[PDB]
Design a binder for these strands. Structure first.
Ligand SMILES: [Mn+2]
Ligand SMILES: [Mn+2]
Ligand SMILES: [Mn+2]
Length: 430
DNA sequence: ATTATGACGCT
DNA sequence: AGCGTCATA
């Protein structure tokens, strides 16, 4: 009754850029705008690997992870932009810099948690209390929410899509009680008004469009964001959760897309998020561990407490390259040449980071993969990072991996290396 | 031969 | 510490 936590204490948003690397390339090259377009890395192997796809191109069935040669079969007029290559490798700097543009705009509104290169969470609880106080029990007009969907509406007693959005919004606003500054539905709505403003600013100041979700926690905000992409935002209320979850595949919720989610489905013999409500907290804990079980017990009821971390900057800076198939590194000087290439990119990015962000990395992580290993990393070793020097860093990396070579003679490397990875970590203020 | 990342959890 | 899981362009 009066003591049941409902997890409606916060207003959290997730803002996620639409087809982000594609938009970055479309801004730069107007010829790619409003076309089936994709971003590709490399070219030689089957036309290159697609890592971002415009919504026009998705209509033809083009997806991420597709080889460009295969995508061309679905969509002959597909336009392509290539990821930059520097020092023999893909270099993602243009996209990291475009990300910073967006993160700095979002930070004007609230402390953000950078969750990826193209998305951040915002805790808008405080900002909502402020906007409510100036509102002065003013109703919220539909015109203040021009791109917002209310999940689950319209419902009950027009065949166009924008018509449907407006009808749902009208029902939502009609039902609102703007008289109560502590009403969670009202707070979400004011949250959505602020996110319209945030999104307008992003687009005005960068040219990039984005989508967003507004809810009471990060997981619901993330899920909400995806419901009406592209270029729209979606409000998922506490009350909308039972219907939403009653047909929502478990794998759709963040963190459940892998082995754990598969095990929830297998062990409990269920399919949808809402079916989880029929288990006790102890029952879920028994199968999935203390932390996961409690998290599942609350999550299936729309409740989650994971805070929005105040972290706008990535806490690691890394450089990685695969050496597939026959390109696997089989000689010493090969290994040393590529460690230098990686190390030089790292030094470049590290030095820029120190200047911009007043910090220094203190640990260097070196990872490799060896042929045969299904695993993604075969081996990970750390050493001190005391100087931003590429030659020192590459020499040190070699030192930590020197012994992995199984060949008797030292000139050859075996078994051949199919991946090198250098990561700077453990930052301290400077 | 999707690749290049980046965060968090376990022991 | 090193490994594993999950995620995101
Ligand atoms: Mn995106
Ligand atoms: Mn994203
Ligand atoms: Mn995506």
């Amino acid at each position: 009754g009066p003591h049941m936590a409902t997890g409606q204490d916060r207003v959290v948003a997730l803002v996620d850029m639409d087809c982000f690397f594609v938009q970055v390339e479309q801004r730069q090259n107007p010829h790619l705008r409003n076309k089936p377009c994709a971003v590709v890395q490399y070219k030689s192997w089957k036309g290159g690997g697609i890592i971002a796809v415009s919504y026009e191109a998705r209509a033809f069935g083009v997806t991420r992870s597709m080889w460009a040669d295969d995508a061309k079969k679905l969509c002959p007029d597909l336009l392509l932009a290539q990821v930059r290559e520097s020092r023999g490798k893909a270099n993602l700097t243009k996209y990291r810099e475009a990300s910073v543009e967006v993160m700095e705009i979002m930070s004007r509104f609230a402390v953000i948690e950078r969750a990826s290169i193209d998305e951040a969470y915002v805790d808008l609880t405080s900002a909502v209390q402020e906007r409510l106080q100036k509102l002065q029990g003013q109703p919220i007009s539909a015109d203040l929410l021009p791109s917002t969907y209310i999940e689950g509406l319209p419902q009950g007693p027009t065949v166009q899509k924008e018509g449907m959005r407006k009808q749902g919004l009208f029902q939502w606003l009609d039902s609102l009680q703007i008289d109560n500054l502590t009403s969670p539905d009202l707070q979400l709505t004011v949250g959505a008004v602020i996110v319209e403003e945030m999104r307008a600013a992003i687009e005005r100041e960068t040219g990039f469009q984005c989508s967003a979700g507004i809810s009471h926690n990060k997981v619901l905000a993330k899920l909400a964001c995806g419901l009406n992409k592209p270029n729209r935002q979606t409000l998922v209320s506490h009350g909308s959760v039972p219907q939403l979850f009653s047909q929502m595949p478990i794998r759709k919720i963040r963190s459940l897309g892998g082995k754990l989610g598969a095990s929830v489905i297998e062990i409990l013999g269920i399919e949808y998020m809402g079916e989880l409500t029929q288990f006790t907290e102890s029952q879920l804990q028994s199968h999935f561990g203390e932390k996961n079980g409690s998290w599942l017990y609350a999550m299936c009821r729309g409740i989650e407490h994971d805070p929005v971390k105040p972290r706008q900057l990535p806490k690691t800076i890394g450089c990685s390259k695969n050496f597939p198939g026959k390109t696997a590194l089989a000689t010493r000087e090969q290994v040393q040449w590529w460690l230098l290439q990686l190390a030089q990119e790292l030094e470049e990015r590290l030095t820029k980071d120190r200047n911009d962000n007043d910090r220094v990395a203190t640990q260097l992580v070196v990872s490799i993969r060896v042929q045969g290993d299904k695993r993604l990393s075969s081996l990970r070793r750390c050493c001190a990072l005391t100087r931003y020097d590429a030659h020192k860093m590459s020499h040190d990396a070699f030192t930590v991996i020197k012994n992995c070579n199984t060949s008797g003679i030292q000139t050859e490397w075996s078994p051949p290396l199919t991946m090198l990875f250098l990561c700077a970590t453990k930052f301290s203020a400077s």
